[PDB]
Symmetry: C2
Subunit: 244 residues, 2 copies
């Protein structure tokens, strides 16, 4: 069959949740892509907290993060997300999307190494313009759903230009769901500082005999629907019989 196939029926899952957006799927065995919107699949947005994936990789590879157990002490500044107001390691910082910990990583990485690593990763537009500690939230960096899939496929295969160890640790930190039928490794992101306000969910589904990569973004008028990126993606995964 064709390399990319458009399936507009997935739009019903967006419409149900009063949104619009794109889901991109990649069948690794068959080397075939599926999307409800070919053009939005290639439209580039701020990555927001999906940037915690490359940020983690670079921080581990440079020794800014020694391992997934190293504690990053709360700076003692009360923020609006309760789970951020405590000590974190890489596992909990990824799980609760703890921006302050990743802002500290970014400052220690520095502009020069951050720029060189994103170039080596071929990551989105590779543009870190703005604050070294906020550019993925309100700076110049842009990435499309298809570019997220290209990056994730390299991570899955340990083909990024960082140690095998760095890639294994980040894939561990990405763990979201597992049962006897499937494993999901993924990262949410909510781009709310600059229009258009969007939610991301990017990662993959590990089956016994295949991997399905996914990258989705949706218009997100308010953070009321934080759970929606996952709920919409799962409706598409269920329709395509990837998960029960």
């Amino acid at each position: 069959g064709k390399e990319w196939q458009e399936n507009k029926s997935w739009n019903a899952h967006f419409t149900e949740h009063k949104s619009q957006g794109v889901v991109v799927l990649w069948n690794e065995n068959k080397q075939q892509g599926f999307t409800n919107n070919l053009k939005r699949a290639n439209q580039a947005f701020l990555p927001a907290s999906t940037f915690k994936i490359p940020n983690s990789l670079i921080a581990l590879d440079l020794g800014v993060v020694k391992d997934e157990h190293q504690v990053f002490k709360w700076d003692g500044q009360t923020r609006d997300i309760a789970t951020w107001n405590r000590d974190h390691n890489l596992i909990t910082a990824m799980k609760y999307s703890v921006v302050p910990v990743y802002q500290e990583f970014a400052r220690q990485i520095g502009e020069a190494r951050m720029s060189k690593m994103l170039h080596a990763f071929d990551y989105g537009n590779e543009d870190i313009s703005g604050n070294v500690d906020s550019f993925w939230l309100d700076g110049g960096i842009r990435i499309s759903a298809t570019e997220q899939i290209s990056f994730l496929r390299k991570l899955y295969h340990n083909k990024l230009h960082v140690s095998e160890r760095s890639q294994r640790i980040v894939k561990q930190a990405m763990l979201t769901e597992a049962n006897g039928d499937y494993i999901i490794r993924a990262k949410t992101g909510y781009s709310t500082r600059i229009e258009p306000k969007i939610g991301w969910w990017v990662g993959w589904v590990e089956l016994d005999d295949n991997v399905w990569f996914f990258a989705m973004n949706m218009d997100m008028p308010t953070s009321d629907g934080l759970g929606l990126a996952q709920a919409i993606t799962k409706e598409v995964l269920k329709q395509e019989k990837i998960i029960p």
Copy 2:
């Protein structure tokens, strides 16, 4: 601060399921152990498929298994477990407890290296007497629930005398269940070749801020009740408020 405490109230979970056995828990932060039966906690049994944990480690460290993607082709001999009659990698061989794949690993490891590795691991009675490809089913090797916990704690901390990489890959292969509340890395086993017939479940529960190691075995006259090992462990984890 007491090291080992007996909690016979867990026996209600065994009685409810018309069963007998032992659950051993270890609170990693507090360095405290809990069990419904101090004597049975320290009684040694054949490890059966719980042996796939050290077997995997040794196979990876010696290069018998290159990585978790390497395919082990079905030998084309029809066996009575449908999931065994197909190709496997380390992930699926662990998940479906595919004995024939691990018997082939054991043959390539050989007696001398298997013996040396189990001594280095301080694994159970370290006795491989019998056939190098079946000793964990009907040879000399024996391990207690408390000995399972001692071995698993070393694996968790990457303290076994094999590469960090080997230990990370086996911990990935052990992934059983994950959600927003906990991660379970574990391995089942069913010892049938010598009395008493027992089911095992050994591993750990990863929380945000703690790890609970567990090792349980139960009398298992038929494979009808294999699912009880997990159900009983979870009733104990719930009673102790480790998981919802």
